[PDB]
Amino acid sequence: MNRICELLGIEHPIISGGMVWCSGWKLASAVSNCGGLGLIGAGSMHPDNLEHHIRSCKAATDKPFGVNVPLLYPEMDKIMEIIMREHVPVVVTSAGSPKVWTAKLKAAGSKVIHVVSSATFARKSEAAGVDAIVAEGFEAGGHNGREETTTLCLIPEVVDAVNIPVVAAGGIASGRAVAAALALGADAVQVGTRFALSEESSAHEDFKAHCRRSVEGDTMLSLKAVSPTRLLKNKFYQDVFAAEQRGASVEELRELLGRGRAKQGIFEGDLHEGELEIGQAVSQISHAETVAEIMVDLVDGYKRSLAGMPTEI
Amino acid sequence: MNRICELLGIEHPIISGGMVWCSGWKLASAVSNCGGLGLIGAGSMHPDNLEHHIRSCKAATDKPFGVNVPLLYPEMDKIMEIIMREHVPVVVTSAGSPKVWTAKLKAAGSKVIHVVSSATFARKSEAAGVDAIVAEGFEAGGHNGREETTTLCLIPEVVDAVNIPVVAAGGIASGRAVAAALALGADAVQVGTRFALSEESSAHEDFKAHCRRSVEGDTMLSLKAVSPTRLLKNKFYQDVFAAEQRGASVEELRELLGRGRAKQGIFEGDLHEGELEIGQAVSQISHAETVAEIMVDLVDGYKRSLAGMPTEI
Ligand SMILES: Cc1cc2nc3c(=O)[nH]c(=O)nc-3n(C[C@H](O)[C@H](O)[C@H](O)COP(=O)(O)O)c2cc1C
Numbered sequence: 001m002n003r004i005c006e007l008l009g010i011e012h013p014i015i016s017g018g019m020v021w022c023s024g025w026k027l028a029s030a031v032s033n034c035g036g037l038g039l040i041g042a043g044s045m046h047p048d049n050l051e052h053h054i055r056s057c058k059a060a061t062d063k064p065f066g067v068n069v070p071l072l073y074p075e076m077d078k079i080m081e082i083i084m085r086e087h088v089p090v091v092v093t094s095a096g097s098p099k100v101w102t103a104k105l106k107a108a109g110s111k112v113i114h115v116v117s118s119a120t121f122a123r124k125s126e127a128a129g130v131d132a133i134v135a136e137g138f139e140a141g142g143h144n145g146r147e148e149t150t151t152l153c154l155i156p157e158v159v160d161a162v163n164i165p166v167v168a169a170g171g172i173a174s175g176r177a178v179a180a181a182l183a184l185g186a187d188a189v190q191v192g193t194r195f196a197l198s199e200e201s202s203a204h205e206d207f208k209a210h211c212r213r214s215v216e217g218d219t220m221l222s223l224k225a226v227s228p229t230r231l232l233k234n235k236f237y238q239d240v241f242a243a244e245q246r247g248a249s250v251e252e253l254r255e256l257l258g259r260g261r262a263k264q265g266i267f268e269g270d271l272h273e274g275e276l277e278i279g280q281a282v283s284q285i286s287h288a289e290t291v292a293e294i295m296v297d298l299v300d301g302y303k304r305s306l307a308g309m310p311t312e313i
Numbered sequence: 314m315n316r317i318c319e320l321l322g323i324e325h326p327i328i329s330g331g332m333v334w335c336s337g338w339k340l341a342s343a344v345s346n347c348g349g350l351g352l353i354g355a356g357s358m359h360p361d362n363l364e365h366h367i368r369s370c371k372a373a374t375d376k377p378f379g380v381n382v383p384l385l386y387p388e389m390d391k392i393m394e395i396i397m398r399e400h401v402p403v404v405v406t407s408a409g410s411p412k413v414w415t416a417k418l419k420a421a422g423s424k425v426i427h428v429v430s431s432a433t434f435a436r437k438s439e440a441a442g443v444d445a446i447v448a449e450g451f452e453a454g455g456h457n458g459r460e461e462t463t464t465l466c467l468i469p470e471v472v473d474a475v476n477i478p479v480v481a482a483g484g485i486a487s488g489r490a491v492a493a494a495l496a497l498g499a500d501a502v503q504v505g506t507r508f509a510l511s512e513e514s515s516a517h518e519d520f521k522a523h524c525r526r527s528v529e530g531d532t533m534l535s536l537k538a539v540s541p542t543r544l545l546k547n548k549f550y551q552d553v554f555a556a557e558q559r560g561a562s563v564e565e566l567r568e569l570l571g572r573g574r575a576k577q578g579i580f581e582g583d584l585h586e587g588e589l590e591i592g593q594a595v596s597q598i599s600h601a602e603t604v605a606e607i608m609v610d611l612v613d614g615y616k617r618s619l620a621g622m623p624t625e626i
Pocket residue numbers: 017018019020022041043068069070093094115136139140141142143169170171172173190191192193194196266277278279280281
């Protein structure tokens with residue numbers, strides 16, 4: 001068995017990334033039903049709503065699903081209590097220390113996966129007792145690592161650094177890229193952007209449609225002095241860029257960033273003032289599609305990509 | 314049959330990228346004698362010196378070789394005359410319009426390849442009549458495209474956009490990355506950083522030893538307001554970073570950049586004031602090695618990568 005398939009009890013080594021405003025039970029349960037692992041994105045859910053999405057996912061699928069928890073989540077104790085009482089099969093943690101919750105989640109029966117952006121942090125997660133890690137490259141949508149290491153340079157270094165399974169994230173929007181990730185030595189892939197634009201994603205339809213119109217170079221890893229974030233170059237980004245060019249302080253950039261822009265953009269469709277988080281691979285997606293269409297494409301595309309490789313060079 | 318092998322008449326689809334201060338005839342002839350395509354880097358050579366390196370290369374290998382010419386080269390008429398008279402088999406142009414010289418080089422018997430960093434420019438180069446393109450990602454060493462597209466995101470877009478062969482550059486330092494490039498649909502790879510640190514490279518021993526000590530995150534795409542360039546975060550970089558943080562104008566940044574820092578760093582081993590151009594993949598290289606050793610590792614590493622891949626997912 002592929003190491004991730006066996007670890008998580010899934011048919012295909014494809015995980016849908018936990019994404020604020022996108023990863024409702026509808027997206028997560030559809031990915032799980034298609035044989036991958038769908039993740040609910042707790043980052044955008046108050047505890048009561050999180051519990052509802054877990055229950056709805058549980059009703060909609062008999063297959064494993066998980067919850068992604070950014071560790072800066074403001075009511076952590078409440079959502080951890082929920083996640084352990086609901087026996088969530090897989091928990092994916094990011095943006096914080098894996099030492100805090102890993103042993104407790106594992107004692108409660110969850111498999112634990114932590115998101116990292118370097119070999120050094122991959123090693124610290126392995127030492128913390130996680131079951132696997134996601135190594136996320138520069139091209140990924142949303143908050144990314146300060147080192148700016150791309151998927152192609154990150155994966156071989158991370159898989160040489162640890163003995164536990166490694167999931168590649170950042171730039172995986174096709175069967176070819178799934179093959180490239182397994183060629184580099186990852187056991188599986190985590191797909192964000194392509195699933196964020198799927199029919200089942202909870203993102204606003206105006207957000208999805210706007211993302212489909214974007215072209216190469218429309219995203220930029222930005223706000224680096226506050227927290228590097230990859231987003232579409234919209235009006236909000238332009239304000240940030242003008243501020244950075246004038247030598248704005250961290251406090252000025254923080255004031256401009258303000259609060260709630262990701263919700264306003266991704267969930268509510270404010271394409272001017274929103275923080276439009278999306279990966280570089282957005283430029284590959286041109287029309288609406290369902291989770292099942294994407295899953296079939298990633299699986300069948302992998303097969304064709306691999307079959308067309310020369311036996312040697 | 315591999316499209317680049319057949320176009321260029323070489324055994325392995327591996328090209329050493331033209332690199333200022335590194336790609337002398339010793340590096341270029343050694344790569345070509347190992348079955349790839351070694352490029353001479355004309356960017357760092359006055360016209361008489363360039364003629365010397367072409368002639369020493371021809372004396373050292375009976376196999377195909379090429380010359381890399383950045384199109385900002387100050388005495389362009391003199392060096393094209395030399396390249397044409399010597400009938401260089403392959404000419405790789407970068408940093409300028411492929412319309413200026415392509416038709417003339419082809420009329421003189423050279424294969425012409427142009428370096429691009431977007432699918433849009435790939436198409437413009439194809440319209441200009443080039444024989445193939447190199448598509449160079451964000452992680453590459455030296456001057457990169459302003460879109461900051463990574464190799465993983467750039468290759469499948471470029472390959473879908475043109476009918477001519479595509480060589481992937483940026484992040485290729487192992488057989489696993491060669492397998493990744495080919496999985497994305499590239500025909501061949503161009504390897505810069507790993508060859509820049511080889512025994513045969515003309516770069517200063519202190520520069521090579523210094524690159525070997527560096528770790529993930531030690532490079533940064535910088536000077537973006539002037540011309541984006543990926544280099545090691547040395548004292549020069551810190552001066553640039555401090556000036557960008559205070560809102561320096563473009564003229565202030567040009568003044569700081571000055572002239573000849575790339576030669577001082579790469580060729581003369583000035584690790585403090587030099588512009589240490591090198592790719593993110595530098596962190597995978599730990600010790601000195603020859604071109605023959607690199608070529609064998611790339612070829613055998615490719616087969617090992619395939620051995621690790623499941624036929625279907
Ligand atoms: C809109 C959006 C929201 C995201 N929110 C989160 C999140 O809440 N927690 C997290 O760990 N990663 C988050 N991510 C990162 C994704 O889980 C995933 O790792 C990334 O999107 C993968 O790269 P890709 O976009 O190139 O597919 C988000 C990504 C996007 C595009």
